[model samples]
Target: GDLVFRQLAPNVWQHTSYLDMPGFGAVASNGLIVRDGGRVLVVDTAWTDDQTAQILNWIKQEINLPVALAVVTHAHQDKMGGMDALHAAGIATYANALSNQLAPQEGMVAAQHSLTFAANPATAPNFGPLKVFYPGPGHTSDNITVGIDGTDIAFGGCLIKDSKAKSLGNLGDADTEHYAASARAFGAAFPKASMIVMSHSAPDSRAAITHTARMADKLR
Candidate 1:
């Protein structure tokens, strides 16, 4: 039941490390929850059902708002696997157009249940809140960065150009051509974002978006 938040913008707070479930890879996904007017929106479910539930509970108990939407950045279990858990708690989920097209090949539904040891996870939900566009392919073929122009906050998903800079490995799930294109598309789309928050990186400068994009070009 421990979660910390930092305001990166007006009414936009990043829930850094929602759950503390180490040793369990799938239960350690980071997430973003935003409050817009009366609607509460979530971006990507954390690593596990319990972690997600705890974060949601903290938010509801503290903020007292219904989760209007949930957005998945990509198809990785760490990012989208907890949808069943969130769905069961009455949260709507969403993703890019390609996510719907590619989820079947990755055994997303099965993986969620297997992790829960055969528990019946709610049906895999669809993307919500933002428009589904192919912001190119960097982390995965279906990666889509969520854009909130009004708030100047964009969840760049896993399209991080320099995962190495963040002391992590590059996500080689993307194609050379598309990866470059998506990186540019992401930068172009969020030109006004002064504080871009990543899924794992310690909060950094919005300039890192271009820096990461340039680093990603090295791949091309």
Candidate 2:
């Protein structure tokens, strides 16, 4: 019943679990969808395009609008693997500057990374404006946050999983120090935002911001 999004506030939303990656972890990632105006923005295109199709179909059932962009939260396959489908469907796409910086280092054997994403005929035809930001790195080097301007809503994109006291997961592959730095940077970038929706786990208010700031400060 909650598979469809409910208005968390005004235009921000948390999708019903399309795929629950965490079997029994303390945290589970929740995908996000935001309606800016005439268009909508989908954060992190799930593991498969078929699942993405279900998301899109569900969105269509709610509003007769077009998808403005498909954002990849991090370089993780679970986050970005659906690019091919969105690209094939002509949806504009984007990722953080770090995603570009570390893609090769992360060892993507796929010949088409950004090229296949930006130039697919089927996907290109339906393209819309897409943008990415460097909130810094936490889960991985490529992690970034995406925002919908009108609503002043931002998706943390896995940079900050939840607002609670927990030890950082050892992302030995990540720039751990920088990941902490990025969380601060992302929060600094949008102090005015009404809500911060993480790609996984719960949403946080300014109070959570205070907690995260304390944690990040401790990291340094």
**Which candidate gets the maximum lDDT versus the true structure?**
1
What TM-score does each of the candidates earn? 0.76, 0.72
lDDT of 2 by residue, 1-220 (tens): 1244656766666664445344344334446676657888777765555766766777888765887676666676556656666776677666543455455566431212342232211111122333345554466755666555555556666566565537443344566665655666556566655567765556666555556546665665
lDDT of candidate 1 at residue 119, scale 0 to 100: 15
By TM-score, the best candidate is: 1
TM-score, predicted candidate 2 vs. hidden true structure: 0.72
Candidate 2 regions exceeding 4 Å error are 1-4, 16-20, 23-27, 100-131, 150-152, 169-172, 216-220
C-alpha positional error of residue 185 in candidate 1 after TM-score superposition, expressed in Å: 1.0
Error of 1 at 201 (Å): 2.2
lDDT of 1: 0.59
lDDT (CA) for every model shown? Answer: 0.59, 0.57
lDDT (Cα) of model 2:
0.57
